[PDB]
Each structure stands twice: as structure tokens, then as C-alpha cells.
Amino acid sequence: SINSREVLAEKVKNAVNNQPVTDMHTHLFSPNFGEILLWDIDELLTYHYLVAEVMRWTDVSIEAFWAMSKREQADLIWEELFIKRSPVSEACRGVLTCLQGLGLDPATRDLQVYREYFAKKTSEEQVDTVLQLANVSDVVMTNDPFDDNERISWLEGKQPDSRFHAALRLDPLLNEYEQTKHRLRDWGYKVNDEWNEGSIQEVKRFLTDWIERMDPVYMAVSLPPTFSFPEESNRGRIIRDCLLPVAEKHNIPFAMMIGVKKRVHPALGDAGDFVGKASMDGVEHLLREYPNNKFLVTMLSRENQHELVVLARKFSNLMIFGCWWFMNNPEIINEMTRMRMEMLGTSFIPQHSDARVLEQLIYKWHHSKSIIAEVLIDKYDDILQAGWEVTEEEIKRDVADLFSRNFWRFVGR
Amino acid sequence: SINSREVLAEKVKNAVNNQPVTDMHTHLFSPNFGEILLWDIDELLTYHYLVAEVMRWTDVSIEAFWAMSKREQADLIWEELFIKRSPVSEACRGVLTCLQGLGLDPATRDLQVYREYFAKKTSEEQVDTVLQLANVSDVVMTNDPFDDNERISWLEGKQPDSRFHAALRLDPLLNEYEQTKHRLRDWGYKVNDEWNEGSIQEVKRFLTDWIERMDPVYMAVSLPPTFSFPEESNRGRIIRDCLLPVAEKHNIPFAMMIGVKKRVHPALGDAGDFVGKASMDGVEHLLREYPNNKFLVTMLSRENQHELVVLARKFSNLMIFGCWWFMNNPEIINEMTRMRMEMLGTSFIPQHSDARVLEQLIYKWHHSKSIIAEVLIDKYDDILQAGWEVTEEEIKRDVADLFSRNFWRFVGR
Numbered sequence: 001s002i003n004s005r006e007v008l009a010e011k012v013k014n015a016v017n018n019q020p021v022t023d024m025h026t027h028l029f030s031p032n033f034g035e036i037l038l039w040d041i042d043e044l045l046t047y048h049y050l051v052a053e054v055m056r057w058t059d060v061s062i063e064a065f066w067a068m069s070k071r072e073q074a075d076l077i078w079e080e081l082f083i084k085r086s087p088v089s090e091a092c093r094g095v096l097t098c099l100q101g102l103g104l105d106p107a108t109r110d111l112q113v114y115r116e117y118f119a120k121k122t123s124e125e126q127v128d129t130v131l132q133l134a135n136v137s138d139v140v141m142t143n144d145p146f147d148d149n150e151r152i153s154w155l156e157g158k159q160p161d162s163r164f165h166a167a168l169r170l171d172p173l174l175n176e177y178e179q180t181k182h183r184l185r186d187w188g189y190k191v192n193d194e195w196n197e198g199s200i201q202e203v204k205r206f207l208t209d210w211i212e213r214m215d216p217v218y219m220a221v222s223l224p225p226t227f228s229f230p231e232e233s234n235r236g237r238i239i240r241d242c243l244l245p246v247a248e249k250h251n252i253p254f255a256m257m258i259g260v261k262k263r264v265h266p267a268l269g270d271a272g273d274f275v276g277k278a279s280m281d282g283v284e285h286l287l288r289e290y291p292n293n294k295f296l297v298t299m300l301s302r303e304n305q306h307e308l309v310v311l312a313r314k315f316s317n318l319m320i321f322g323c324w325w326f327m328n329n330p331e332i333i334n335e336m337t338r339m340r341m342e343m344l345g346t347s348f349i350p351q352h353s354d355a356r357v358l359e360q361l362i363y364k365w366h367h368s369k370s371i372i373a374e375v376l377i378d379k380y381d382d383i384l385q386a387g388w389e390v391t392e393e394e395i396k397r398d399v400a401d402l403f404s405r406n407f408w409r410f411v412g413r
Numbered sequence: 414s415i416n417s418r419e420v421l422a423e424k425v426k427n428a429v430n431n432q433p434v435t436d437m438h439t440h441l442f443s444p445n446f447g448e449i450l451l452w453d454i455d456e457l458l459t460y461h462y463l464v465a466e467v468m469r470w471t472d473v474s475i476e477a478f479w480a481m482s483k484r485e486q487a488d489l490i491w492e493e494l495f496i497k498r499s500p501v502s503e504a505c506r507g508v509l510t511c512l513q514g515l516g517l518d519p520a521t522r523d524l525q526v527y528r529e530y531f532a533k534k535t536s537e538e539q540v541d542t543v544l545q546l547a548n549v550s551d552v553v554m555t556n557d558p559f560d561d562n563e564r565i566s567w568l569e570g571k572q573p574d575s576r577f578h579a580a581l582r583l584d585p586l587l588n589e590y591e592q593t594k595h596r597l598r599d600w601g602y603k604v605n606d607e608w609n610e611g612s613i614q615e616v617k618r619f620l621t622d623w624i625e626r627m628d629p630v631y632m633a634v635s636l637p638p639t640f641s642f643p644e645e646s647n648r649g650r651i652i653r654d655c656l657l658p659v660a661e662k663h664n665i666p667f668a669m670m671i672g673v674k675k676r677v678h679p680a681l682g683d684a685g686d687f688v689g690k691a692s693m694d695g696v697e698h699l700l701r702e703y704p705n706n707k708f709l710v711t712m713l714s715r716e717n718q719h720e721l722v723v724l725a726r727k728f729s730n731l732m733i734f735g736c737w738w739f740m741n742n743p744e745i746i747n748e749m750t751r752m753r754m755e756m757l758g759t760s761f762i763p764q765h766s767d768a769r770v771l772e773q774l775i776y777k778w779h780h781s782k783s784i785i786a787e788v789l790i791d792k793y794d795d796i797l798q799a800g801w802e803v804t805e806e807e808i809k810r811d812v813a814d815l816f817s818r819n820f821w822r823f824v825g826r
């Protein structure tokens with residue numbers, strides 16, 4: 001039986017380590033979609049998190065950086081962030097965890113040798129390897145139909161294998177309708193100059209056509225710190241007249257990733273986004289006024305985290321998830337996961353990888369699981385010491401909810 | 414390939430229940446038009462059908478009734494027609510069907526709890542709820558340009574959403590021209606004292622102006638039992654020289670609801686109209702003499718129903734529809750629907766709801782569909798007995814024709 005923190009620690013760590021993970025938000029693609037799925041050490045080293053970091057150290061111009069080849073970029077970052085300075089940051093640590101996880105030894109710092117490993121392997125094989133090592137059963141993608149490369153694949157019949165699931169990303173439609181409406185009409189969606197019945201129906205038709213083609217687990221959008229709802233704006237009316245009705249009809253949840261301030265430093269590309277605290281008014285209104293709609297929410301500002309948890313206490317149709325981006329750091333992952341558990345028990349989704357490069361699934365889940373395991377150990381021990389019987393079976397059940405079941409139960413699949 | 418009677422009944426009922434309905438005559442309005450759209454339990458209980466019925470029981474004078482507030486009128490009707498006597502009449506049965514459909518429970522007879530349901534929703538939300546429950550996809554309104562409230566609404570650009578369609582009601586123009594002509598000139602339509610070229614072209618202009626503003630699926634008028642045509646009167650002349658030619662040009666059907674005798678009991682208001690049998694001469698003449706015009710007809714007298722069916726056998730430019738008002742009772746709906754199918758096959762429109770209160774769509778259609786399903790089952794079964802085997806697809810086709818396709822195909826939309 002489990003009758004001590006010591007015994008508990010072992011059981012929790014084992015259960016957490018063995019629980020197959022459903023990664024509900026990533027930037028990975030089923031291997032059959034082609035090169036859009038990024039992988040290998042050079043891709044790991046050029047993750048935009050490391051681009052931002054290297055630029056704080058290197059005298060190499062950002063324009064010169066983008067001009068270099070992928071290998072040149074990787075060599076520079078490795079040299080600047082691993083050799084000239086110890087790789088102690090979270091993103092650098094992550095690269096190391098991946099290498100070790102694949103059987104490569106960071107002790108040698110032999111980059112040329114690490115590279116050879118990847119060269120003698122295919123995309124399909126590396127996917128098998130990584131999913132096995134990271135113990136990830138299901139990966140949810142981010143599918144942007146407004147991206148020409150991504151859109152052509154779906155239109156031409158490309159479909160993910162069983163391990164990969166689609167999520168209809170809609171940032172251009174909701175946040176740039178003034179420019180995006182012209183593309184809809186180019187694709188046959190007769191949206192008019194004014195927001196009338198015709199415009200509302202065509203936008204709904206656009207969403208329905210893409211839902212049928214992708215069979216998404218949810219529709220998503222990243223939003224700025226200034227997000228508000230209700231709102232007399234293109235976004236406010238599209239959400240009110242089109243997105244919500246369609247989502248309820250198909251019982252598809254609406255995922256909102258709030259707090260991103262896009263391109264405060266354009267020259268840095270994907271690495272040029274900032275953060276800002278948002279008002280909870282919009283989320284609060286959406287949850288209260290649309291009780292038949294489901295909402296998946298994650299916020300970027302550290303200062304929004306505690307109140308988001310309290311908001312989940314208020315509305316069952318709100319399912320909070322992950323420690324997103326700038327929140328995806330040990331210090332923050334820990335505080336967020338503890339506040340969440342203390343006020344929500346196990347009724348939340350503690351994490352997602354947001355993996356942009358295949359191998360990251362290894363470090364993202366290993367770094368997170370160790371922290372989540374420690375929180376669970378503290379929480380289980382507190383009730384154990386209080387006289388409660390905790391069985392290994394109940395631990396596996398709870399761990400399964402946190403890393404997989406809660407999501408699937410919420411999406412309705 | 415259906416050969417057993419049980420499967421046949423099963424497929425017919427499923428097809429009827431699943432078939433999205435086009436309700437081609439109601440007194441409902443798109444929710445954006447305002448409070449003109451009536452809804453909720455108090456509105457249901459004060460429907461004029463129940464006003465007439467409660468007066469046969471209550472000692473409360475009609476004057477006092479009208480003096481009462483809406484909620485007080487509802488309480489009296491509830492007490493008098495539901496508590497003091499079993500609510501077995503069709504209208505009272507309808508209110509119950511509505512409450513049950515909404516998820517409310519008639520068993521408790523808790524009127525206050527029922528009211529609480531409506532109080533927590535908006536008109537927009539309730540229309541969404543009711544259109545779904547009643548599986549009604551299209552509602553045809555009754556739009557009267559002679560009503561100040563309605564007119565100004567159409568003048569200020571108000572447009573119904575895609576679920577609602579307009580029908581240009583002309584009772585004041587055709588039945589009260591003498592008093593109405595002064596309003597036509599007040600609006601810039603210079604009709605002359607006598608019926609000449611100018612008076613004819615200005616009346617046409619009025620019609621055309623409103624057809625362009627409403628884009629009605631048809632033009633309508635309710636007529637008395639004494640209706641005649643040809644006829645040297647304002648109605649006879651306006652119809653001959655204006656209505657018909659204008660209707661033919663725009664290929665717009667002319668709907669005539671014949672048989673009502675207005676205000677035989679003035680104090681009852683909307684619940685004070687009576688019925689009388691009409692001559693078929695006028696309708697016979699119109700169909701034969703104006704073959705390029707389309708006519709939608711429904712009559713109020715039980716005694717007019719059989720010959721109307723026969724008239725439809727004579728003229729393809731006649732499309733009979735629904736079981737109107739005093740005909741909208743199970744006993745009459747059943748005999749009417751059977752006489753119609755027996756002499757016209759599927760070439761007619763069996764029903765319309767005539768809803769004045771939103772929630773009525775639930776009971777109007779539920780009560781009618783069960784009866785129409787019964788008739789279909791019997792007729793399909795009769796040919797099955799002869800050796801004919803229908804396919805489930807042919808059934809869905811026939812059902813679609815009756816509840817929606819016959820109307821749109823007839824109006825040409």
C-alpha cells in the first residue's frame with residue numbers, strides 16, 4: 001500500500017512517466033505532409049527561441065543571420081549559446097535533453113557526430129522514434145488554411161495518420177478580416193462590403209467547409225492583450241455571428257490563446273512577438289453568455305494566470321490548458337500548476353508542448369512531467385497524511401485525466 | 414425496396430420528422446425587427462384562440478379582460494382552461510406541446526417556473542431554440558406596408574435574416590381602397606377620384622415599389638365568403654388591372670385566403686372573426702382567364718375543401734395550401750389531407766402554421782406532422798399491397814416536396 005511520501009513519490013513518478021501523452025497544441029505535422037514537418041539537430045538549434053537568445057550575444061547582424069544557411073545558423077547558435085556560454089537557459093537545456101534522449105552524448109559536444117545520427121534516417125522513422133521516446137500517443141497540429149503551402153496540401157487530399165489530429169487555426173480571418181475577406185472571395189466565399197446576411201452565411205460556409213475537410217478537434221485563434229468581447233469590430237461580429245454558432249452546432253470547442261503582441265520586433269520574424277496582460281472581461285462574457293459553447297483557454301501573461309484559474313472555478317464550460325510560450329519555464333510552470341491544482345483539483349490540462357521541431361516532444365514532456373510529478377507528490381502526500389487512502393490505481397486514473405483524458409473528454413471524442 | 418409495413422411506417426415517420434420545414438404563412442417576424450415578434454408562455458396563453466375559449470367559461474367580462482395586464486390575462490386563461498377544466502382543446506393542447514418541447518414539464522403545472530425559462534433568454538436565442546426544435550428552416554412572414562410600425566421598419570432598411578421571407582399583404586388596398594387611396598396619395602401615389610389610366614399606373618407603382626423593397630415570395634389577401642370576380646368594384650378592378658399584370662411580370666404568385674367574415678364580435682378583437690362558405694366561381698374564373706399567373710389558395714369553410722381540391726385537378730396554375738384557422742383541427746386536417754392526396758397525389762402544400770407567437774412552431778408542426786405521416790403511411794401501404802415497393806429515397810423526395818419543395822418550386826425560388 002502507499003503509506004509514505006517516499007512510496008508515493010515512486011508511484012507518482014512511475015505513473016507520470018508511463019502515461020501516454022496527448023499533446024493538444026503543437027506546430028508539428030503528420031509525416032506524410034512532407035518537409036513542413038521539421039526535425040533534426042539543426043532545426044532544434046534554429047528554433048526561434050534560440051534565435052532570440054543568440055541575438056543577445058552575437059555580433060552577427062540579424063540580417064546576416066537570416067542570410068546564412070541552416071547549418072551556418074546552427075553552428076553560430078551552438079558556438080554562441082553552448083560553447084561561449086554555458087547552455088543554462090530552458091530552451092538550450094531542452095536541446096541537450098533531446099540529444100541525450102536519442103542516445104547522443106552532450107558530454108562530448110560533438111555536433112558533427114550528432115548530425116550523422118539524423119542523416120541516416122527518414123522522417124517516418126524519426127517520428128516513430130520520437131513518439132516512442134517521448135511517450136506521446138497523440139499530437140494535435142495547428143492547421144492554417146490561409147497559409148498557401150498548408151492549404152494546398154489539404155485541398156489536394158493530404159490527410160494525417162491516426163497519431164495526428166487537426167485544429168483549424170483562424171488568426172487571419174478573425175484578426176485581419178479587412179485584408180482576409182478579399183481572399184475568401186477569391187476562394188468563392190461571397191463576403192460582401194458590408195456585414196450582412198450574405199457575408200455572415202459565406203463566412204459560416206467557409207468554416208463548415210474547413211471543419212468537414214479537417215475534422216478538427218477545435219477551432220483556434222491567438223489574440224492580443226487588448227482582446228474584448230462583445231465588440232463592434234470584424235472580430236467581434238465574426239465570433240458572435242459565425243464562429244460561435246458553427247462551433248456549437250458541431251460541438252467543437254473554441255480555443256483562445258490570449259496575450260500575444262505580434263511583431264514588436266519585425267526583423268526577428270517568429271522570434272519578434274511580445275506579451276501583455278489582458279482583461280478577463282471578454283472571456284468572462286463569452287463563458288457566461290454562451291453556456292452551450294466550449295472554450296479552451298491559455299494566456300501568455302504571468303499576471304493573468306491566477307485570475308484565469310479563478311474564472312475556471314466559475315464556469316464549467318471553460319477548460320484551461322498549458323503553460324504557453326513565455327510561461328513555459330520551470331519557475332512559472334511550477335507556480336501555475338500548483339495554483340491550478342489547489343483551486344481546480346484535476347479539472348484542467350496542465351501542459352502542451354507547442355513543439356515546432358519534432359524532437360522537442362522529448363524535452364518539453366520530460367521537463368514538464370518532472371515538475372508535474374513533484375506537484376502531484378506534494379498534493380497526494382497532503383491528503384495521505386490527512387488519513388486518506390490513495391491507491392496506485394487512482395493515481396493512474398488522475399494522471400491519465402491530466403495528460404490525456406481531460407482533453408478528449410472536453411472535445412467530445 | 415421496402416416490402417414490410419413496419420419498415421415502411423418507420424421510414425416515413427423518420428423522413429417526416431427529419432424534413433426541414435418551410436412554413437409558408439405565419440405572423441412571425443425576423444427577430445431583428447423588434448418586439449413585433451411575439452414569444453413566451455404568456456404570449457402563448459393570450460393567443461386569440463385562447464381568448465375566444467376562455468370567454469366561454471369565465472365570468473370576467475371581455476372589457477375587464479382587456480383591462481388586465483398580459484400576465485393577469487395569462488393567469489386567468491391558465492386557471493380557466495387548464496385547471497378548472499382539462500386542457501383538451503387543440504389550442505390548449507398546443508400550449509402544452511410547446512412547454513414539453515422546450516424541456517419544460519407540464520406535469521408540475523408550475524406556471525411560474527415556466528415563465529422563469531423565457532425571462533432568461535433573448536429573442537434571438539429563443540428563435541434559434543425554436544427553429545431547431547420545430548426543425549423549421551424557412552419562415553414566411555405576413556408583411557403589411559399599411560401598418561405604420563411595419564412600414565417605417567422597411568423604409569429604414571431593416572432586412573430579415575436568411576431564415577425569414579417576406580410576403581406582401583394587401584388587405585387594406587384591395588378591400589378598403591376608398592379609405593386607403595387617401596394614404597396612397599399621402600405617399601406620393603396620385604390615384605385619381607375615378608379609375609383611369611393614371612390611377613392604374615400609380616397602383617402598379619405602389620406594388621412594384623414594395624415588391625422591390627420586400628422581395629416578397631408572393632402577394633397576399635384574405636377575402637370574405639362573398640368574394641366574386643370579375644366584379645365592378647375597387648377590388649375587382651385593382652386585381653384585374655394592377656395586381657395580376659404586376660404579378661405576372663415578376664412571376665409572383667397571388668395568395669388568396671378566402672372565407673373569413675371580419676369582426677362579427679367587435680369586442681373580441683382578433684378573436685372576433687367568423688367564417689362563411691364561398692362560391693368557387695371567382696377562383697375558377699381567375700385560374701382559367703389568367704393562365705400565366707400563379708395562385709396560392711386556402712379556404713376557411715369546411716364545406717369549401719372538397720371542391721377546392723377538385724378545382725386544383727382542373728388548373729395547374731392553382732396550388733392549394735394548408736389547413737387554415739378553423740380548419741386547423743385534427744379532425745379537419747385529417748380529412749382534408751386525405752381528400753387532397755387521394756385526388757392530387759403529392760401536388761399540394763398540406764400545411765402552414767399561421768404562428769402568431771414564436772413557440773407555436775413547435776406544436777403547429779408536431780401536431781400536423783404526426784397526422785400527415787399517418788396519411789402517407791396509409792397511402793404508401795395501399796400501393797405496397799398492390800405490389801409497388803418504394804425506396805427510402807423516394808419517400809424523402811415526396812416528403813421534401815410536401816413540406817418545402819412544392820412551395821419554392823411554385824413561387825419560383
Ligand SMILES: O=C[C@H](O)[C@@H](O)[C@H](O)[C@H](O)C(=O)O
Pocket residue numbers: 027142222257270324325326354356
Ligand atoms: O510557443 C511559441 C510558439 O511557437 C509561437 O511562435 C506561436 O505563434 C504560438 O504558440 C501560437 O500558436 O500562436
Ligand SMILES: O=C[C@H](O)[C@@H](O)[C@H](O)[C@H](O)C(=O)O
Pocket residue numbers: 440555635670683737738767769
Ligand atoms: O389562424 C388565424 C390567424 O391568426 C388570423 O388571425 C389571421 O388574421 C389570418 O390567418 C389571416 O392572415 O388572414
Ligand SMILES: [Zn+2]
Pocket residue numbers: 025026027354
Ligand atoms: Zn503555438
Ligand SMILES: [Zn+2]
Pocket residue numbers: 438439440767
Ligand atoms: Zn394568417
